[PDB]
Symmetry: D3
Subunit: 150 residues, 6 copies
């Protein structure tokens, strides 16, 4: 349904490099509605929890540290197939393998500093959202440009 | 030869969402010459005739209505391999499956409202052109940036 | 009223330099609705008539010749104070005195090749329109983004 | 000092027309740091309090309603002379009289729907900020591109 | 004559902030031809000589130091009235006072780090050019888009 | 290592069509540092040597001729995996087969005039670089945005 949602978060490197508006604009132009938005610096707790499935991976160490080394613009978009489209638009893990046109492909270079995070599945979406956003912070209703869907 | 032409038409949603300029600019930046251009509201007759090959398809119903529910910017471009290139740049039918950088992949979200139409073969081009444009409305001669071809 | 109209025409140099979409996009982004659009090569008659008020000026010679030396994308936009806003966005006669942000300021250099024409007054608007467009070629109705006006 | 801050808020039409990203990007490109950001629907109380100085003005009626008829992206930027600069970049009250390059001059058309609001004085900034943002939602420290200041 | 030239130089902050391409593109779009281009780190000797006219000015110390603290992309453009046009495009000394649309107005914030330098007069152009480019490094001939001048 | 380098060169058509700034900006946005830059007209000697590997290929004649028919903007970028990243960004030989988003895919149409050249391997990079730049013209040190690498 045209009410699917995903969790996106411009990480400390996207924020510091001034890529917040560019990244948001790409999604707005696509047709997805912003449903929640806010800036905060993640806590170790939030980072670990957010990155739970990578608990015993060599990189989990650095993920947690960096994602809490500064402000993060957390956000929630909504729209048909937003979870698949978002990831698609984001690119692939390694910015260097990301095709031009995608976020990481156009702006990224080191997997350590790959600008943004997008939920991988509606399952991780629903969890990630409920982790970063008090339900109060999300639009109870949404009306997309009528020229978007049939 | 560097004289092939394709028919393109920003559909009611492209036009209504204000994507006429961006769409044209993308092909102008590519190296193709506008040989014709015009805005109008297609008639049931033209829509049906335009969508002939999909007469007995479940969606044809909605195709003809929508493409006539408002203004359409019909246009004809020219240049080497313009037909294959236009489609590539337009993306795939479902905007969600269209790669970033393509028209439908950057601004589309529903198959029902997918912004633009490009001729799929030189065969359909020749026909589609002849349908929307009286031959008088088309450049009898063209001169592209000399820096474009060899 | 939000129904005022103006006549714009990307001249042979804007067209040849590939500035059609860029110029159209600027107006679309502003909030004005396209009401008519078409491409044609002006005839000596049309040029002279169009440039009537400059009949005995040293430059009238060249204006007429050049504006008929190639295709011209004639168009008609609509919206509140479109005639004043259009000119504003176009810039001033001499591209070099045109501030950055305007069309001529960003793209122009020689007054001889100043990319575009915009009607100077609603009076010249109403005349110019009726000169370049058979009434049939203009939308009988218009519905702008409801987010545009109050 | 390089710590001055101003309050900005993309109004319902900016948000609805999908201009959140572009607006933010313009200030990010300028050199200012986002110290706070969030989206919400203002309450009659906040709108009235926000528009206090215009209590007995004919338009105040519509100001409070509209700014509460939908989501608003409130945000706080920081940097040298940010208040005077923001306003300059925003343009003048009437979007039609706003020069190209400014926000209102590039995308606005009606005084009623003029996209964004910027604090007019450091005095109103300090107040406006304190109204929409709990001090917890604001960066306690900021570090701008070292290439920005001397 | 359409062969006047000016010396432009992206200072260390423009270079470090990644504004080289944007700045060149702005002039390329305008109509001016690149006649010389190169990246180098100014030597104290060159900075001093280049800033000769401000020898005993308070800021002279920092101008020389900063402009040699890193790579500068020196360039020479050519075109009718380029010197007055480049300056207009660059904006005014204080980036805060630069109108949106201008280089300094779109990206600068401190007078000390104001991105780029443009010759002030044809007098200074001829001089400045002769100072940073060996005559061999400048095009002996130039052919601008024929759609540019009359 | 984040110090790998590649040789890029905007060919005469990219230079003449005014794509220099756009092409540099694309790489600047990606994360790569400009380490050398300059504009020159290739001599037959250099074109031949540069195209050595295609000595007895049918197209070799035109490659050498065309690349010396005008100014070429030679440049050397630096960054982790730049050689494979630059190539990806450039697209594939036939601009018609280049995906949208890539340089050749966004602006090129003929294999003969395909805008830019990027080294194919670090082997060719080291060689090509050594051929168009005297070691003195390349930065002896580089400091990329700290928000780029881990
Ligand atoms: N090698 C390495 N070094 C550092 N950080 C890394 C590395 N591999 C993965 N990551 C980041 O951790 C998340 C891994 O998600 P993936 O599903 O892409 O894992 S994998 O790398 O593809 O195996 C994912 O973070 P988010 O995308 O922010 O969720 C990766 O970007
Ligand atoms: N679901 C749905 N709804 C509406 N129209 C649809 C649908 N699926 C296919 N089509 C349209 O048929 C056009 C050609 O389709 P194919 O090339 O995919 O077959 C193509 O439109 P144009 O490209 O505008 O001709 C498709 O949009
Ligand atoms: N010196 C000179 N040489 C060539 N062409 C010229 C010259 N002066 C004006 N024009 C063009 O003619 C129209 C004149 O309109 P203006 O009202 O601007 O006249 S004036 O030049 O300001 O006196 C106007 O054309 P449009 O803008 O296409 O209507 C000018 O661009
Ligand atoms: N006609 C009309 N309709 C609605 N609102 C209006 C009108 N005229 C003034 N105002 C709003 O008052 C805000 C401050 O106005 P001034 O600085 O122009 O006094 C300013 O809005 P904000 O900038 O959003 O606060 C003006 O839009
Ligand atoms: N206080 C201060 N600090 C640093 N640099 C300054 C200062 N005031 C003037 N300038 C710069 O010196 C150049 C000439 O200034 P004027 O245009 O005022 O003369 C010009 O530098 P360029 O940017 O190279 O033109 C000015 O912007
Ligand atoms: N027919 C024809 N005409 C002109 N030039 C051609 C032709 N086919 C290949 N090339 C160009 O030669 C370079 C190497 O080609 P390959 O990638 O195919 O090896 C590469 O040039 P660069 O663009 O300098 O890399 C090719 O794009």
């Amino acid at each position: 349904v045209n009410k699917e949602r995903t969790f996106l978060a411009v990480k400390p490197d996207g924020v510091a490099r001034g890529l917040v508006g560019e990244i948001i604009a790409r999604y707005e132009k696509k047709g997805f509605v912003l449903v929640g938005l806010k800036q905060l610096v993640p806590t170790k707790d939030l980072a670990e929890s957010h990155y739970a499935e990578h608990k015993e991976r060599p990189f989990f160490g650095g993920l947690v540290s960096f994602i809490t080394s500064g402000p993060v613009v957390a956000m929630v978009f909504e729209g048909k197939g937003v979870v698949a489209s978002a990831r698609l638009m984001i690119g692939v893990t390694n910015p260097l393998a990301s095709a031009p046109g995608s976020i990481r492909g156009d702006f990224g270079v080191d997997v350590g500093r790959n600008i943004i995070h997008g939920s991988d599945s509606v399952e991780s979406a629903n969890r990630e959202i409920a982790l970063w956003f008090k339900p109060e912070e999300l639009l109870t209703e949404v009306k997309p440009n009528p020229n978007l869907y049939e």
